[PDB]
Design a protein around this ligand. Structure first.
Ligand SMILES: Nc1nc2c(ncn2[C@@H]2O[C@H](COP(=O)(O)OP(=O)(O)O)[C@@H](O)[C@H]2O)c(=O)[nH]1
Lengths: 240, 1521, 237
């Protein structure tokens, strides 16, 4: 029955030590509903909790979608019917969680961010683009068009702020670049644009690795090698 | 899925039980063989019984191996055409002399008989027909006296292995070809011995006592004279103008006359081994043996090979091994590339050989490159080695005269810190030797990687740290022991490093204890200060230089070795590249090295690189690892000073946030370290493939407390490995080498104690490879204990083999008996035993050497012999008892005798003998001294679990002495049978032999073992009866010999293109290529081998590429080109493009392949729908086709012996069918034809102009039939015309000549809407050949009356499944016990009855076709009485047995659509059926030819497969239990 | 047979492919409430689904209890009270799941077992014993004693049926032995008894491995590895 902020964040800490992410997500719901700007640690907790809760359902969704695609060839009405119903159930669950997340960012986090809180607004725009991407991953048609437009607008804003005030080796900006490129490659189906953006971010972070502190250095790398893997995967299947 | 990251997740980044883990699973016959039956007498067949008249035409008999005595005179006169009289091992006493009275007899073989002392020939017989008078291995005392006056045409008189002592007759015989006096006791030969034989070519006298040749005739070709007592070769051999080979081994000669004393231009093979030759004169005329190909000079006292040996370019197999004083190969033999074998046994050269290649052809290339330009090489290794800290870095930094020494306090050495420093000596010698200094790691943490870097060519140093004098030197003994263990002949210079600090009496202890007791050759010592330059430093420098220059391992002077200048240039380019390689990743890929060698003007190829890189590795520039297990041959490590520095990083720093693993055990974790300089993990796993690190280094040095389940001193057996000091690289490498030891399941409990394993499976079996130190004994012991149970014996055998292999591989210094002094050998491998069973209170030592010396008995006893202990319970490694218990020797029942050489018959002068075992004849193999006990058990442990029916299977093996027992190949190796018993080959047994070897190859490949050596010499046969379960067998000894000691290069004649070149690694595709070569040879029946024996270099260089000639064109044999397509698939140069063994076996497994003789691809874009065979001219039958590509008629003559297709336009309208009518009179066969215009056209066989069309018939002709009606009491024939109206224009045999033949009985059966399209004939002749034809849909028949006998309707069916399948025009009809009817586009065949006229059966093609994967009936053809064939509209053939079972087999994947279906007979291979299918990719009518004999075979072979599978699955229970 | 069983089982299958363990738990629950004996596939699917849902909670309970013990020494009332509330919440979730599975077992699954249906009754007694010791992991006091008494009774019945009726090498019997042994060691705190039953099961299986079919060979040995592993771990002092 603990309500205050400290008990909430400590409950979130226990949850992340307990591998129970739903309670963590509720705790961050309440912490953000306290309408106070979030520090780095609470922000990280909110991010990881909601990332896990969306990732579980996303894994369930792509598994079920692959099963549906395989079973569609055989053509049995009942199995396709129940598969479609279960996929719709998972889709509704994803839509509920993502709508909660985006309502939270629109109503609480971006609103109380000052004009000088550049990193906070970029980070929030970052997950909002990510979660609109998650919506699009199950959306088709006009709803898909609306969500991709929303995610593109959010991503362009986030990229512009990132360019204007972050230095390129900041891990937040690199993660934004990775998720933007994933959006371009997977949703926009424009691998050239994603490759160009990823290579630009890669070269820019090369430009500054000379004068990076080791604490920031490994933070830069542990995103950089993944970025380079994404580039190599995208550049290994060109026109042949 | 793309890598998406939550940056929050980025910021965020005990077992205690083991309960249930949800496993939740999921024409008289000729050859009769009477050899195997024990016949004491053959007098039963000599009488006048029912078989006495049939024997007259035998021509072939085998009465060998039985116990006949005194062959009856009646039988030899019974038959008068016998020409292959073969019988040996019969218990006769004297030659009958009555066995030569028949008319024409040759091949008279008596090869083992106990013929009397004299074999005098009765002069009352004058038979010259004898061609082989084989008198092998008799008790003869004198050559048959009446050979001259009785047998005149004798060619092969073989009397080897006899006791003919006195000088023989002048031998007035004129027709000899080959003479053999081998293994006789001869004093000499008379001057008129061979003066009356001007035709001999292969005289061979072996194992005799002869002195000189008595005027050998110029006719000689082959002379074998090894094993004699000489002093020089007499001139009578030296003047033979046609001598081709000379075997002179096991002799005592002194001088070989040079080229100007042989007077021959065709010397090829020169065997002069085991003799005493001092000079090899070749200077006078080097080109005079330009065609010599073989030259064996082994076990001789050769001084040096003259430079003129570069001229005999034909030399192929050179042997100068066992010389022990050669020490040099001239650079001139590098021009002589034809060598494929060059043994290098027991001789030392100016270079190190046999690293991983050196397969006797890279040696030639090395010598040639050295001939190009030879320059001295000056690169030594100075491996400074210390302990925990000494004057190593401080002494090396001042030995190098490094003035700077910027680091005022240099930290501890990590890795080896490889450095190179030049020394230009300011003296007379300009030689500027440069040598690398490797200051190894003092600290004991790194001690498990150093042995990798201790090469036999080095000048080691060790450093005292004299401050702790007389005590620290005691701790340095392990280092010198390791130096001896790694490089026995490597000088060591110990140096003191501390004179400013304080104890100089260390010289006394060094000279007293450390000098020369089981330690390396300490050549000098010094007491340098190692702090500032002084006269001591100058003396140390002078000593180090003087010792480097006088290294002389094997007296060779390594400091000035000679190599090709290409080596120097490549060393220079890699040195230049060293400063241009990324610091973060100094490894160079193979492509980079190739680009580097391309940039400059180097002269090596892709094949000179492997030896170049290894020599340069031996001289410390770049480390490359060519071992296939370490999949890092692509990587090349330039500037190793980085690689060692990185490999030693892990041993120094280990960090864990939580102790998730015990100390010494590390989970697989990656550390980025350098970023983006490509990052590659193969070196990360190399860190484990080095066996460096699970890190055995720093792994629980104290042993955990461990208690054995049983320690009653009787059920356990112990072995001890007392050695002075455990080498550094021993315990970690032993622990990793043990890996897993499998008692012949569930993985054991594995414990990893720094020196110890103790892996166990149960209280029944365990293995404690411990390390304990006994009190009052400074030495270190490796105690190993296992239970006495059988699994324990297997475990002990495997671990003792592994530890001995490790010691033989990495530490040759220890296991080397030092003759100087005494045989201490530094490894006193003890064996502990106790007479008192339990509570013996003492374990008694006994050296393993003396125990293995006690192999004369099986039981070991002390001086008090009443109580005894079995050896096999004290050391199951000496007794071959660790292997499965079904392979014991059991010498009691082994009826064996090594001494006789007539039991050596298996193989010519081979080591495989013949003896009796368990009551049956077996082929025993005697092992020589070459194979050691470890090697033999390594071979037999892998040979003890092959067990495959078409493979030789080990039956017994044991000691006293060392042999091996395998199954006896009664027919021997396949090469002999394909070279002189081709008549036994009859176009079918080739298939079975190929099947059996293919099964063996497939089984071996499934076991991940490839034969790598598969020749007709390796196919051991057992029977020649084709319908046998076990026929062919491939020797499994080749793979054992390959894997035991690593003929891996293979025979040059039968070798894959990728193996002889040696550039690419080998695979199963080489075995596939060799199998295709076996197919080619077995098709040629030893035709290629004969051509290759006289031209070996071309025999190899022609088959090295895929350009083998057409077997049918070059060699007279049956074409059978289907298997030629299989060969071309297996002859492909691309390895992966060749089919795998499983696929070729399966396509061979089909019974249709032997039957399908061939396939003819008729030229592009032609359509044909009719065909007729020719049977009367059975000598050669050509095939006549029609035309469908043109609306007009065009006859298509096609031959079969020439495959020559011709086109001739003959009709204005397309011809739909043909027929052959033959007239016994006038000897001709007219060819009639029918077209859509009704123009019945007749054409002569041999005349293309005598064409006269018959009456123009109103409609389109659909069928033409030639029949057999002899109703006029004489040979008569008619003709039948199937047309589109049912009008039968029946003609006569002889009336077709006249223009417009008058029909006999015009029978209009059908209507305009009911046409006629098919005819057939009765299957039997007792019904006067009732003929059944199909008009429209109903079936109808006549007889000689030519009236409609039946009007059976098929549309009115009461089992309607579909209408049009029965309501359509007929297509085919066959006359048998039942009637099979197929309609147009009808995939269902109807079975009608002749009498009851009812649908007895309804067989649907799809009812079987849909079970294996369009598809409908296209054509039909029935056999005589056994099988039916349905021609599917696709590329599937179904075999229909009309008797009991419908489906026999579906043959698909050969074509795409089957258009015609009919039989024929061709060229003495009668009764062959023909198909013409399509293979669309454009219509290609693939005419394909299939013999019809198989209805028995198609089921007999599968009966040979079902019986194959059962024993391929039955006696695998031996592997289980 | 009024509700489509096949739809439920196919839903459970697509769930086990979709790691949605709660949904398979509910579906398995329903199909067993359908009051007809469960097949081996359905029975084991029920087993794995409920084992997974209980095991995630068991792991959560273990980690939170560990942090409670490590933080109780610091003497922070807020920390201790919060962790105590969270661990009691984990325990109450475990108790809900466990009472559910226990009612499902005793009310439905054991009740409809015939006298000759040895395998089913053995399996269900194994399940109830497993869940009872699961409670014992979180039960204390007199409740702890009552649960371990029930677990010992059920284990004894299952062991007696299995040993009287079927061979040692059967996977269910050796899994029964494994669960019995771990109950003796971890709950009873009687290592000697656990070792004795473990070795008895071990050598009883070894006595007849010679004539084991290859199909059952891995089924036996993959868990015999577990018996031997805990035997090695237990006798390490
Ligand atoms: N004071 C003194 N120090 C010495 C003398 N000889 C060697 N040393 C010390 O020995 C050390 C050499 O380190 P070293 O053994 O080469 O490190 P390692 O290669 O890892 O074993 C230096 O730090 C020197 O100070 C000496 O004569 N006097």
């Amino acid at each position: 029955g603990m309500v205050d902020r400290e008990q909430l964040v400590q409950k979130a800490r226990l949850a992340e030590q307990a591998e129970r992410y739903d309670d963590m997500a509720a705790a961050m719901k309440n912490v953000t509903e306290l309408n106070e700007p979030l520090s780095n640690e609470e922000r990280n907790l909110l991010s990881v909790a909601y990332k896990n809760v969306v990732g579980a359902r996303r894994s369930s969704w792509r598994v079920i979608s692959s099963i549906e695609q395989k079973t569609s060839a055989d053509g049995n009405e009942k199995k396709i019917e129940m598969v479609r119903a279960y996929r719709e159930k998972i889709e509704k669950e994803l839509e509920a969680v993502c709508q909660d997340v985006l309502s939270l960012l629109d109503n609480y986090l971006i609103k109380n961010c000052s004009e000088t809180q550049y990193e906070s607004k970029v980070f929030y725009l970052k997950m909002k683009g990510d979660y609109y991407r998650y919506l699009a991953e199950v959306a088709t048609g006009e709803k898909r068009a609306t969500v991709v437009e929303s995610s593109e607008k959010a991503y362009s804003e986030a990229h512009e702020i990132s360019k204007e005030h972050m230095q390129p080796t900041h891990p937040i900006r690199l993660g934004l670049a990775l998720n933007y490129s994933v959006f371009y490659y997977e949703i926009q189906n424009a691998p050239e644009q994603a490759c160009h953006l990823a290579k630009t971010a890669f070269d820019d972070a090369i430009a500054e690795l000379d004068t990076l502190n080791e604490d920031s250095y490994k933070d830069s790398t542990l995103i950089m090698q993944l970025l380079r893997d994404n580039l190599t995967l995208w550049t290994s299947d060109q026109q042949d | 899925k793309s890598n998406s990251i939550s940056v929050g997740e980025f910021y965020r980044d005990q077992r205690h039980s083991n309960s249930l883990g949800p496993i939740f699973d999921h024409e008289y016959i000729t050859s009769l063989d009477l050899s195997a039956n024990e016949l004491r007498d053959i007098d039963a067949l000599s009488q006048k019984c029912c078989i006495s008249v049939h024997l007259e035409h035998l021509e072939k008999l085998e009465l060998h191996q039985n116990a006949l005595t005194s062959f009856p005179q009646q039988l030899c006169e019974t038959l008068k055409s016998l020409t292959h009289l073969d019988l040996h091992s019969n218990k006769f006493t004297s030659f009958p002399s009555y066995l030569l009275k028949m008319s024409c007899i040759a091949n008279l073989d008596v090869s083992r008989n106990d013929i009397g002392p004299s074999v005098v020939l009765d002069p009352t017989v004058k038979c010259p027909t004898l061609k082989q008078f084989n008198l092998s291995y008799n008790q003869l005392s004198f050559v048959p006296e009446n050979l001259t006056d009785v047998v005149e045409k004798l060619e092969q008189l073989i009397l080897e292995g006899n006791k003919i002592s006195g000088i023989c007759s002048p031998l007035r015989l004129k027709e000899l070809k080959i003479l053999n006096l081998s293994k006789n006791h001869i004093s000499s030969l008379s001057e008129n011995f061979l003066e009356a034989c001007p035709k001999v070519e292969s005289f061979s006298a072996r194992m005799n006592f002869l002195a000189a040749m008595p005027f050998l005739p110029p006719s000689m070709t082959i002379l074998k004279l090894s094993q004699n007592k000489f002093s020089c070769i007499p001139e009578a051999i030296l003047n033979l103008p046609h001598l081709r080979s000379l075997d002179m081994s096991s002799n005592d000669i002194q001088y070989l006359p040079g080229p100007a004393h042989w007077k021959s231009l065709n010397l090829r093979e020169l065997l002069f081994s085991h003799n005493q030759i001092s000079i090899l004169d070749l200077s006078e005329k080097a080109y005079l043996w330009s065609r010599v190909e073989k030259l064996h000079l082994s076990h001789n006292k050769l001084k040096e090979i003259p430079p003129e040996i570069g001229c005999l370019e034909n030399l192929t197999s050179l042997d100068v091994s066992y010389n022990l004083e050669l020490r040099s190969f001239p650079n001139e033999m590098g021009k002589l590339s034809k060598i494929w074998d060059l043994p290098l046994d027991e001789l030392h050269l100016n270079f190190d050989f046999k690293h991983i290649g050196c397969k006797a052809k890279d040696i030639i290339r090395f010598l040639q490159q050295r001939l190009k330009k030879a320059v001295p090489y000056n690169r030594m290794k100075l491996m400074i080695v210390g302990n925990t800290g000494s004057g190593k870095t401080t002494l090396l930094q001042q030995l190098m005269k490094t003035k700077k020494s910027d680091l005022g306090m240099q930290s501890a050495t990590v890795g080896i810190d490889v450095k190179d420093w030049p020394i230009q000596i300011r003296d007379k010698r300009k030689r500027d030797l440069v040598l690398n200094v490797w200051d190894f790691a003092g600290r004991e943490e790194f001690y498990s990687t150093h042995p990798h870097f201790m090469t036999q060519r080095a000048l080691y140093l060790a450093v005292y740290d004299l401050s702790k004098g007389q005590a620290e030197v005691d701790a340095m003994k392990p280092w010198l022991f390791n130096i001896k263990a790694r490089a026995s002949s490597s000088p060591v210079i110990l140096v003191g490093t501390h004179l400013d600090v304080s104890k100089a009496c260390m010289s006394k202890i060094t000279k007293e204890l450390l000098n020369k007791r089981g330690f390396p050759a300490i050549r000098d010592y010094h007491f340098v200060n190692a702090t500032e330059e002084s006269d001591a430093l100058a003396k140390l420098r002078k000593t180090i230089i003087n010792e480097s220059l006088n290294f002389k391992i094997r007296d060779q002077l390594v400091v000035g070795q000679l190599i090709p200048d290409c080596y120097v240039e490549l060393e220079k380019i890699i040195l230049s590249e060293r400063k241009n390689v990324p610091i973060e990743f100094p490894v160079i890929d193979r492509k980079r090295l190739l680009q580097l060698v391309r940039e400059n003007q180097l002269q090596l190829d892709e094949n000179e690189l492997p030896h170049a890189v290894h020599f340069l590795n031996e001289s410390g520039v770049l480390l490359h690892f060519q071992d296939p297990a370490l999949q890092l041959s692509d990587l090349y490590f330039v500037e190793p000073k980085w690689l060692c520095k990185i490999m030693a990083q892990i041993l120094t720093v280990k960090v864990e946030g939580c102790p998730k693993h015990p100390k010494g055990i590390i989970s697989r974790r990656d550390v980025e370290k350098f970023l983006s300089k490509n990052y590659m993990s193969q070196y990360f796993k190399l860190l484990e493939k080095f066996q460096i690190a699970l890190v055995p280094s720093s792994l629980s040095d104290h042993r955990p407390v461990i208690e054995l389940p049983h320690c009653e001193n009787s059920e356990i057996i112990i072995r001890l490995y007392e050695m002075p000091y455990f080498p550094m690289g021993f315990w970690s490498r032993l622990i990793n080498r043990l890996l897993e030891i499998s008692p012949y399941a569930l993985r054991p409990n594995r414990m990893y104690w720094r020196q110890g394993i103790y892996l166990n499976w149960s209280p029944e079996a365990y293995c404690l490879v411990g390390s304990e130190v006994l009190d009052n004994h400074p030495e270190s012991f490796l105690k190993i204990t296992v239970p006495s149970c059988r699994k324990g014996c297997i475990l002990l055998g495997q671990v003792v083999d592994h530890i001995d292999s490790l010691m033989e591989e990495w530490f040759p210094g220890l296991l080397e008996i030092d003759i100087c002094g005494e045989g201490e050998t530094l490894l006193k491998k003890w064996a502990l035993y106790s007479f008192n069973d339990g509570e013996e209170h003492q374990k008694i030592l006994l050296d393993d050497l003396m125990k293995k010396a006690e192999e004369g008995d099986l039981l070991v006893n002390p001086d008090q012999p009443r109580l005894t202990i079995p050896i096999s319970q004290i050391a199951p490694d000496l007794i071959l008892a660790d292997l499965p218990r079904n392979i014991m020797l059991n010498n009691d029942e082994l009826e064996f005798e090594q001494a006789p050489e007539f039991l050596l018959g298996d193989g010519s002068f081979g080591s495989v003998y013949r003896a009796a075992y368990e009551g049956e004849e077996v082929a025993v193999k005697i092992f020589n001294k070459h194979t050691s006990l470890r090697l033999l058990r390594q071979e037999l442990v892998v040979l003890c679990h092959l067990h495959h029916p078409s493979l030789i299977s080990l039956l017994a093996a044991g000691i006293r002495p060392r042999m091996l027992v395998m199954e006896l190949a009664s027919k021997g190796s396949l090469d002999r049978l394909l070279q002189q018993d081709k008549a036994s080959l009859t176009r079918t047994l080739q298939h079975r032999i190929a099947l059996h070897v293919a099964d063996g190859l497939r089984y071996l490949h499934s076991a991940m073992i490839i034969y790598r050596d598969l020749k007709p010499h390796n196919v051991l046969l057992f029977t020649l009866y084709p319908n046998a379960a076990i026929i062919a067998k491939i020797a499994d000894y080749g793979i054992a010999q390959y894997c035991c000691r690593m003929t891996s290069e293979g025979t040059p004649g039968f070798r894959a293109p990728e193996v002889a070149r040696g550039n690419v690694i080998y695979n199963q595709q080489a075995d596939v290529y060799s199998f295709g070569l076996l197919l080619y040879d077995i098709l040629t029946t030893g035709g290629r081998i004969v051509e290759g024996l006289k031209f070996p270099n071309e025999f190899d260089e022609l088959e090295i590429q895929g350009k083998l000639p057409d077997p049918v064109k070059e060699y007279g044999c049956a074409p059978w080109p289907m298997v030629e397509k299989l060969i071309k698939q297996c002859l492909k140069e691309n390895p992966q493009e060749r089919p795998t063994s499983a696929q070729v076996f399966d396509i061979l497994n089909s019974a249709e392949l032997v039957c399908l003789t061939r396939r003819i691809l008729l030229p592009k874009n032609v359509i044909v729908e009719c065909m007729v065979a020719t049977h009367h001219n059975s000598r050669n039958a050509s095939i006549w086709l029609g035309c469908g590509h043109t609306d007009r008629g065009q006859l298509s003559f096609l031959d079969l012996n020439t495959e020559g297709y011709t086109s001739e336009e003959v009709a204005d309208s397309r011809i739909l069918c043909l027929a052959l009518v033959h007239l016994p009179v006038e000897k001709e066969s007219w060819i009639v034809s029918g077209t859509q215009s009704g123009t019945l056209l007749v054409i002569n066989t041999e005349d293309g102009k005598k064409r006269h069309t018959l009456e123009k018939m109103t409609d389109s002709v659909t069928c033409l039939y030639c029949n057999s009606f002899s109703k006029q009491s004489k040979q008569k024939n008619f003709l039948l015309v199937g047309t589109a109206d049912g009008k039968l224009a029946i003609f006569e045999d002889k009336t077709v000549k006249l223009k417009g033949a008058a029909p006999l009985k015009i029978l209009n059966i059908g209507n305009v809407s009911t046409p006629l399209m098919c005819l057939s004939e009765s299957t039997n002749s007792t019904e006067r050949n009732v003929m059944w034809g199909g008009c429209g849909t109903k079936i109808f028949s006549f007889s000689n009356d030519f009236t409609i006998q039946k009007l059976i309707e098929t549309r009115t069916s009461q089992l309607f499944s579909y209408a049009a399948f029965s309501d359509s025009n007929i297509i085919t009809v066959v006359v048998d016990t039942a009637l099979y009817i197929a309609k147009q586009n009808s995939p269902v065949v109807e079975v009608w009855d002749k009498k009851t006229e009812k649908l007895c059966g309804l067989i649907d093609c799809v009812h079987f076709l849909r079970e294996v994967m369009s598809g409908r009936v296209k054509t039909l053809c029935l056999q005589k009485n056994t099988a039916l064939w349905i021609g599917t509209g696709g590329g599937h053939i179904l075999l229909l047995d009309l008797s009991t079972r419908r489906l026999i087999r579906v043959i698909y994947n050969f074509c795409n659509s089957v258009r015609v279906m009919m039989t024929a007979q061709l060229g003495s291979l009668k009764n062959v059926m023909l198909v013409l299918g399509y293979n669309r990719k454009e219509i290609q009518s693939c005419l394909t030819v299939w013999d019809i004999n198989l209805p028995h075979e198609v089921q007999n072979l599968e009966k040979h497969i079902e019986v194959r599978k059962e024993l391929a699955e039955k006696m695998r229970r031996t592997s289980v239990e």
